Design a protein around this nucleic acid. Structure first.
Ligand SMILES: [Mg+2]
Ligand SMILES: [Mg+2]
Ligand SMILES: [Mg+2]
Ligand SMILES: [Mg+2]
Ligand SMILES: [Mg+2]
Ligand SMILES: [Mg+2]
Ligand SMILES: [Mg+2]
Ligand SMILES: [Mg+2]
Ligand SMILES: [Mg+2]
Ligand SMILES: [Mg+2]
Ligand SMILES: [Mg+2]
Ligand SMILES: [Mg+2]
Ligand SMILES: [Mg+2]
Ligand SMILES: [Mg+2]
Ligand SMILES: [Mg+2]
Ligand SMILES: [Mg+2]
Ligand SMILES: [Mg+2]
Ligand SMILES: [Mg+2]
Ligand SMILES: [Mg+2]
Ligand SMILES: [Mg+2]
Ligand SMILES: [Mg+2]
Ligand SMILES: [Mg+2]
Ligand SMILES: [Mg+2]
Ligand SMILES: [Mg+2]
Ligand SMILES: [Mg+2]
Ligand SMILES: [Mg+2]
Ligand SMILES: [Mg+2]
Ligand SMILES: [Mg+2]
Ligand SMILES: [Mg+2]
Ligand SMILES: [Mg+2]
Ligand SMILES: [Mg+2]
Ligand SMILES: [Mg+2]
Ligand SMILES: [Mg+2]
Ligand SMILES: [Mg+2]
Ligand SMILES: [Mg+2]
Ligand SMILES: [Mg+2]
Ligand SMILES: [Mg+2]
Ligand SMILES: [Mg+2]
Ligand SMILES: [Mg+2]
Ligand SMILES: [Mg+2]
Ligand SMILES: [Mg+2]
Ligand SMILES: [Mg+2]
Ligand SMILES: [Mg+2]
Ligand SMILES: [Mg+2]
Ligand SMILES: [Mg+2]
Ligand SMILES: [Mg+2]
Ligand SMILES: [Mg+2]
Ligand SMILES: [Mg+2]
Ligand SMILES: [Mg+2]
Ligand SMILES: [Mg+2]
Ligand SMILES: [Mg+2]
Ligand SMILES: [Mg+2]
Ligand SMILES: [Mg+2]
Ligand SMILES: [Mg+2]
Ligand SMILES: [Mg+2]
Ligand SMILES: [Mg+2]
Ligand SMILES: [Mg+2]
Ligand SMILES: [Mg+2]
Ligand SMILES: [Mg+2]
Ligand SMILES: [Mg+2]
Ligand SMILES: [Mg+2]
Ligand SMILES: [Mg+2]
Ligand SMILES: [Mg+2]
Ligand SMILES: [Mg+2]
Lengths: 114, 200, 118
RNA sequence: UCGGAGUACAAAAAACCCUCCGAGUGAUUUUAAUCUAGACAAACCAGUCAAAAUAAUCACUUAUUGAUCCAAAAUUUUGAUCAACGGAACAAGUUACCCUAGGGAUAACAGCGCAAUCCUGUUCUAGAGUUCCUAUCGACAAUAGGGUUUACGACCUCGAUGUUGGAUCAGGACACCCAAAUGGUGCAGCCGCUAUUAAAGGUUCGUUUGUUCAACGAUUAAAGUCCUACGUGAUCUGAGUUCAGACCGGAGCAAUCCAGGUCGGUUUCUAUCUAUUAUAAAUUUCUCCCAGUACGAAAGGACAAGAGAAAUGGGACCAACCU
RNA sequence: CUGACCGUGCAAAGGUAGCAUAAUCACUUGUUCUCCAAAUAAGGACUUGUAUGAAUGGCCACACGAGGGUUUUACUGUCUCUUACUUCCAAUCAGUGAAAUUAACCUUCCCGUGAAGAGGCGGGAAUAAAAAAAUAAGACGAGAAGACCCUAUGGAGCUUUAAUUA
RNA sequence: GCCUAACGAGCCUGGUGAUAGCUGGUUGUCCGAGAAAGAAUUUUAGUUCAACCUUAAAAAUACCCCAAAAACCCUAAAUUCCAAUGUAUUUUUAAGAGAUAGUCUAAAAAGGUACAGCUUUUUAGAAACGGAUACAACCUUGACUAGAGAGUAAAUCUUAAUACUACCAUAGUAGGCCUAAAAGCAGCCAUCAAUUGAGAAAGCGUUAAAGCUCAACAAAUUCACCAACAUAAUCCCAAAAACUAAUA
């Protein structure tokens, strides 16, 4: 009996998208925080956005997650319109990641007393 | 008249969820217009031939002046697949032979309103009930409410300290290892497709 | 799948007559648990075997003593169907140095400090 | 090989000859640079982000891609349906003339599992039955069972469980084909048609096919349906399938091949062990009567009782006959 | 009803003379007559065989086959349906004296179970001990590391447009 | 075909201890610790990496883990991540192999026939010398050596199913309408009104009538109603049992 199943190429590995660090994790500058294919979490304070929508930590610190108000860039039109048609009482919210800096910025050392 | 095949025939064979026959029902639990109905006491799959029976039977059995009927169940939307005879396992999913409506225990199949007494309807409804895939009953509002009040009366009259709820929820004797995850909700009254009314 | 399950809080809210029934004192909760292991850790998931290794319950029918703090209570809760728990009682009070050699633990769950005089 | 969904519901991962859509590039302009912290991912190989320091976009956007070696090139780099896509620098058919190593890790036979199909019941009355659901049946449907069919699984056997039909000898089931008691009838009687109870005994001889099946001739009280390794080959037979030779269609350039026909073709065992090696106490016809009476308008036409004959199956026996 | 004719297409030509259900894919136990009480056999016809067919030969015919098939006569133990008697074996006595085979066996039957068919397990039954003679149901009996099937980056023979080529 | 009792290619001696990812074998005692399949592959009867693991070493935290936290429409069991706390484990470094041909049970799903002692993944369990007679996977238990001691664990197999009874029946009027007839009772309309009480009728019945019963009084007594389901092939399958007290 002809057993042809017409479907092809279901097979891909998973991309291991997801959250790499968790709230209250210590982080060094450069660590990737989470990696996603669509924006699930947006970059907050001290979190840089990679061209593939990676989130990495800019400072040395503690990673925090947050629900905050979303005010799209006036250059990006779709989001501008989505913001436009809302009923007059409602604001948009999203989830952000943050780094909270640990090390102080610097120190004043006494080099020489002349 | 319900149509053998849907007007917009499903093109893509779907996985068969046993889960939609399984356990208690949500939709179509309550009466709307009518005084009478056929209540489903098990889960089951209603295909076309059944609709044929309930329809011809219930139409010819009733006085068109004093009585009217209503479908509480959709016309069959779920594709069922077969393979020919003499087929080795594998090669793909088969082709579409059938259409069926899933029916959960505790749902009303047919709703009959009218100025008749429950005795008439009960007289000829018991035939159609008797002929369905699942065990089914002929009921009215009074009957239904009576048996439900009794159904909780049993649970407050229960003389033995041990009920399925208490154990399954407290995971006693590690019983949760033998039970399913759906068992917490069914509270052990439903098992697979079948329903047991006497289970407290 | 099979899982670690859960116990909802209502389970652990005692009724008034449970005090009268198990002879616990309604006013003051009790300090120490005597925990004995009644049943086997075989045929059970690995995490329970773990909990029983931490509690020091390694071999059956030997009593152990534990604090009634919430931290120990959590683990006990996980394995609660394998064990027997009874409140420890001290009629003669707390054992001092001189009594260390004379200690005995009775099946009432009762510690006797002065045992078999002369 | 490569990517999106589902399966895989909320960190990751995750299978199938699973369910569905895609890619082996286009379209632009703005030519999208060096060098180095820390990271994701990961068997490895490949993949990914990226601060500081110097001075690409749209097309669901995610996939648009090939490692060494070896070649050509210039100043530096380009080379693959290597698509069997972790890639052999370059190789196809046949074998019933076959050979070895293995496998019950895997088919054909048989057993087992399951019961789609098949097979016996009941439950429901629309309908047929002129009227009348259920004398005889019965659509759409419900619920139990049986385990012989064709399948499906691959669980025992490949240091062999020898496989179709007959012969002989049969053991068993009862879902009775006869014989025996009976219910119902759209049963007057004669035939009948259905249903209940009953397994001690029976259940033919031929023409054609290897044939079970089937047709057909002639009969019988009937010429049951099955199971037993489709009973039974250390009892028998091989016509058939099933090796070697050979034709005839056909398919191949050929070799060879087609659950297509045809002709021909080795059937081995001295029995170690278990098993086993004769008690009896009938069954069936067909006649003769009854009585051409009971029964029906007549035409056709009974059982029961009682006398006879046979036949078969048990057990024997030679006066005659026949060897 | 068929098609001598008609149109158009493609070919290097368009299968003719014969013969025909055949030692000729299938349908298929083709149709019908003769043959027998009855014939899927045999012979004769019809016959698109859509897969006959003329030196890979086509068609008739003597004469010949230890070739295949069919009928008749006759003959008989093939058979209805077996029987008698002799001889070799045979069994008892006396000599001489092998073979495959064999875990150990103090080696029953039933129904369950079980790697799915039990002398060994479970529940029951039955049961002094040994010879000799028989019969073949079982011991998945004995013989050959299955000739079938599949799998080895195992072989070989054969053939060509396989790839490399003296 | 045949070429010296095996010819698809003789026999012999060399090459030759040919080569077998394939069978088959591999020899004293006693102790420690102990494994189940993620990748690629002329690969799926094999290897080589990872993961687990064994033998040494160096160290520091490891499991458990409350808030807090992880998405946009609907979305369960639950995960991920972390202090306290209960414990002693875990990571690195140096050496090594085997293993990579699994079964069933519970749960979530696919495929198939909402079939398999079926196949394909994910999460758990198991492989008693004790129970389920017998028994690989279910249940009780984890482990040594002696005792002619004790306490217990899982477990021995029970559960049921019935009846229907009086007495009686006139009235307009075969209401209209149809219809061969149509008289409650082929269908439409009406549902009226005598009697104390009787439907412009629920059954059968008739060509239509005719005729049988049900509903209505009158007489009484009342107790119920929700009924059930044939069989297989050697020969049934412990024997038996209502009872001296059991949280045995
Ligand atoms: Mg996917
Ligand atoms: Mg994958
Ligand atoms: Mg039903
Ligand atoms: Mg920069
Ligand atoms: Mg190249
Ligand atoms: Mg490859
Ligand atoms: Mg590959
Ligand atoms: Mg890859
Ligand atoms: Mg040949
Ligand atoms: Mg061989
Ligand atoms: Mg096998
Ligand atoms: Mg056989
Ligand atoms: Mg088979
Ligand atoms: Mg067998
Ligand atoms: Mg069955
Ligand atoms: Mg099957
Ligand atoms: Mg398998
Ligand atoms: Mg074999
Ligand atoms: Mg053998
Ligand atoms: Mg017999
Ligand atoms: Mg019978
Ligand atoms: Mg018989
Ligand atoms: Mg046989
Ligand atoms: Mg045979
Ligand atoms: Mg034999
Ligand atoms: Mg030829
Ligand atoms: Mg010959
Ligand atoms: Mg032959
Ligand atoms: Mg023989
Ligand atoms: Mg003998
Ligand atoms: Mg013999
Ligand atoms: Mg005789
Ligand atoms: Mg011609
Ligand atoms: Mg032919
Ligand atoms: Mg030709
Ligand atoms: Mg020629
Ligand atoms: Mg020719
Ligand atoms: Mg001549
Ligand atoms: Mg000659
Ligand atoms: Mg001749
Ligand atoms: Mg002798
Ligand atoms: Mg013996
Ligand atoms: Mg069995
Ligand atoms: Mg047996
Ligand atoms: Mg002898
Ligand atoms: Mg024998
Ligand atoms: Mg044996
Ligand atoms: Mg045999
Ligand atoms: Mg072999
Ligand atoms: Mg080969
Ligand atoms: Mg080779
Ligand atoms: Mg020779
Ligand atoms: Mg060697
Ligand atoms: Mg390769
Ligand atoms: Mg291999
Ligand atoms: Mg921690
Ligand atoms: Mg396997
Ligand atoms: Mg392997
Ligand atoms: Mg079973
Ligand atoms: Mg596991
Ligand atoms: Mg035992
Ligand atoms: Mg011990
Ligand atoms: Mg009248
Ligand atoms: Mg009145």
């Amino acid at each position: 009996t002809g057993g042809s199943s017409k479907n092809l190429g279901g097979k891909s590995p998973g991309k291991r998208f997801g959250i790499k660090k968790m709230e209250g994790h210590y982080v060094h500058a450069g660590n990737i925080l989470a990696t996603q294919r669509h924006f699930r979490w947006h970059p907050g304070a001290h979190v840089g956005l990679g061209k593939n929508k990676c989130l990495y930590a800019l400072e040395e610190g503690v990673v925090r997650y947050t629900k905050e108000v979303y005010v799209p860039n006036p250059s990006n039109s779709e989001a501008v319109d989505l913001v436009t048609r809302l009923p007059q009482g409602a604001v948009l919210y999203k989830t952000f990641v943050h780094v909270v800096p640990a090390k102080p910025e610097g120190t004043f050392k006494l080099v020489a007393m002349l | 008249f319900v149509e053998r095949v849907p007007l917009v025939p499903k093109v893509r064979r779907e996985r068969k969820n046993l889960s939609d026959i399984r356990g208690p029902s949500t939709e179509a639990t309550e009466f709307t217009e009518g005084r009478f109905a056929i209540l489903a006491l098990g889960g089951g799959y209603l295909h076309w031939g059944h609709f044929e029976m309930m329809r011809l039977t219930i139409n010819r059995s009733m006085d068109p002046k004093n009585m009217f009927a209503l479908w509480r169940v959709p016309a069959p939307f779920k594709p069922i697949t077969r393979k020919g005879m003499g087929q080795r396992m594998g090669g793909g999913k088969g082709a579409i032979d059938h259409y069926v409506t899933p029916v959960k225990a505790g749902r009303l199949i047919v709703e009959m309103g009218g100025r008749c007494e429950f005795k008439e309807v009960q007289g000829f409804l018991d035939l159609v009930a008797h002929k369905l895939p699942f065990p089914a009953k002929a009921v009215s509002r009074e009957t239904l409410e009576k048996m439900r009040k009794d159904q909780e009366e049993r649970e407050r009259n229960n003389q033995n300290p041990w009920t399925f709820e208490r154990i399954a929820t407290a995971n006693m004797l590690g019983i949760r290892k033998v039970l399913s995850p759906y068992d917490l909700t069914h509270k052990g009254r439903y098992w697979g497709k079948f329903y047991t009314p006497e289970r407290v | 799948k099979f899982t670690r399950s859960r116990i909802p809080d209502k389970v652990f809210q005692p009724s008034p007559e449970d005090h009268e029934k198990y002879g616990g004192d309604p006013q003051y909760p009790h300090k120490l648990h005597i925990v004995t292991r009644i049943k086997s850790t075989k045929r059970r998931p690995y995490w329970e075997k773990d909990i029983i290794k931490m509690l020091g319950l390694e071999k059956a029918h030997t009593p152990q003593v534990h604090k009634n703090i919430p931290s120990v209570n959590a683990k006990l809760k996980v394995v609660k169907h394998l064990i027997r728990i009874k409140p420890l009682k001290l009629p003669q009070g707390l054992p001092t140095e001189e009594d260390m050699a004379n200690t005995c633990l009775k099946s009432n769950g009762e510690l006797v400090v002065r045992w078999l005089l002369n």
